[PDB]
Amino acid sequence: NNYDGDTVTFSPTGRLFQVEYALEAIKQGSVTVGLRSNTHAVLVALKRNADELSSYQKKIIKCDEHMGLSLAGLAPDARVLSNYLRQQCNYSSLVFNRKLAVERAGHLLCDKAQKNTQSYGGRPYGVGLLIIGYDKSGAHLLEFQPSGNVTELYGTAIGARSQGAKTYLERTLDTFIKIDGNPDELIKAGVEAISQSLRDESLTVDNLSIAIVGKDTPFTIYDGEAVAKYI
Amino acid sequence: SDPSSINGGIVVAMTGKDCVAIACDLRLGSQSLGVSNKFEKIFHYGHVFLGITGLATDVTTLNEMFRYKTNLYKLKEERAIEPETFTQLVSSSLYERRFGPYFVGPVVAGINSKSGKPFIAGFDLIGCIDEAKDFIVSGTASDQLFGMCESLYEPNLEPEDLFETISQALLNAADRDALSGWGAVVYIIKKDEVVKRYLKMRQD
């Protein structure tokens, strides 16, 4: 009300309204799902279009050969944060000849988002990210929120009607976690998960966006006729 | 490539009875080549006279700089700067360029308008003040001027007598130096009149 003018102000109940308004931008964003087994980690993203004449907004970005994320909210903010991750992943490779740990990737994003919430003039990031990766400690899935809170999960979903997919994964947890050495079956579980967040619209060939990383699989994105298999 | 002895030139200042004299040669050259026989090295800011020897570009620069500073001084103080005060200003300004100095040998001369005391002073290129009762010398024939002044000079000379002494000191000194001469100028300064005389000297 009187305490939402900028990010530097606390409310009388100890809330940061600008950070909460940035969180609101994610809820308006198109649904995206993350889930992993022990061998592979999968991103499934429902892409959104302006109209039938427009293209479908690309949701998934590659960060390294072994790491990348899906976005929900302000796409330009995702570009800034993904570019930062690319540089940090790259710094780790050139200086230490070392693939950046997915956990450190989270810690670096958390600290970058935080600085924008404590200083005058700046604003919070208006996007949520699902980071997947395969490092020295196996498969990983992270959920980034622009409050700074990063969380490691087995599966999750962010965006509009993400509660449907998040409930499904919470039921399916015991099944999909043990889909080891089977990429196509882990994707199928992810495609069935995002399907619980659909209303009136269904998954089409230029609508669905899938990405996978694993043990003997570099981070690769599937769009167009390559995802026709999973409809 | 010695900045102080490219252009050449000399300044000498003497004190008399209730008067001061400052004199300079008119030569500006480029080593062996004589270029100008009209290059005066004595300037004045109110009743305070400044003679500058050394690198000609710095002589011109410092004249313009001290005109600048004495003009602002007069506007704020609402009075003409005195020789004792101006001497301190020159010293301050030269030392401000301690590690990139003006290649000059300045000489202040004038009569304090309040006390009526004759005043002369000399400086090195980094602004060390050399105050004197008798005389100050500067330029490429400083050795010659020191020898002439030390022998010829006597205290409490009348303005007319003082003129003859300072003139003979400059002329004979300038004739033993290759880079000095080509005409000379003598300022006789009394309390409230100043006479400026151009000397006839050998033009080689």
């Binding site: 050139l94 200086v95 230490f96 000849n97 070392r98 740990a101 956990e103 450190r104 810690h107 020295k136 400690s137 | -």
Partner: protein, 233 residues
């Protein structure tokens, strides 16, 4: 621009079937003066790497502090700091190799020659060299200073190429290193008798040996050498 003041001489090393051996004498020379005698020039990083450093000792002590700080920094927000996400010899080397070249590029080098000896997580032997110029190379045998001229020839008679590494045991490999340290004591004027030796095995782990001495030296033949040519007494 530097000049080295207090200096350490040769660091020698070689691979064997199961791991790597590295050795360096305990001397801190001040020009011709053999000033300091208690100087450790082998610095372990975790339980799987040893960094042997020759050249300027002030810059060596700076590199010690960097490696010490690297272990601390790696442990931060790292539950697997003593497991999968522990510091590898390859990580430690590449970091030093980056610093050494960055410093030479700013015309202010760390006046050192460094050999990073260790065993990787997959059991592979790691042995690589870096110096003040940021020049890096790897070989079955690596040595610095006089070691490069005198030790390498002796160590290469044991492991001449890659195929000789599985055929070389830790007993044979250590014997060659200890022999090389004796030859350096004979012929290097800025060497000492006292030295340290470190073995990093993929099975038995890190073995750090201190206060070793050169022994079984041949000096007896000296008594028979009289004059510089014609002298018979």
């Amino acid at each position: 621009t530097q000049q080295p003041i207090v200096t350490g001489t040769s660091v020698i090393s070689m691979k064997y079937d199961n791991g790597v051996i590295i050795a360096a004498d305990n001397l801190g020379s001040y020009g011709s003066l053999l000033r300091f005698n208690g100087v450790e020039r082998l610095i372990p990083v975790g339980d799987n790497t040893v960094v042997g450093i020759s050249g300027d000792i002030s810059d060596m002590q700076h590199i010690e502090r960097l490696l010490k700080d690297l272990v601390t920094e790696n442990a931060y927000d790292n539950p697997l700091a003593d497991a999968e996400e522990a510091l590898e010899p390859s990580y430690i080397f590449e970091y030093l190799a980056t610093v050494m070249y960055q410093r030479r590029s700013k015309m202010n080098p760390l006046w050192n020659a460094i050999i990073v000896a260790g065993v990787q997580s997959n059991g592979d032997q790691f042995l690589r060299y870096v110096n003040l110029l940021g020049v890096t190379y790897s070989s079955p045998t690596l040595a610095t200073g006089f070691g490069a001229h005198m030790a390498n020839p002796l160590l290469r008679k044991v492991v001449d190429r890659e195929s000789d590494i599985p055929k070389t045991t830790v007993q044979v490999a250590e014997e060659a290193i200890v022999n090389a340290m004796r030859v350096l004591y004979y012929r290097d004027a800025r060497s000492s008798r006292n030295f340290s030796l470190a073995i990093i095995d993929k099975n038995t782990g890190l073995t750090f040996k201190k206060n070793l001495q050169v022994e079984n030296m041949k000096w007896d033949f000296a008594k028979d050498i009289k004059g510089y040519g014609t002298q018979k007494i």
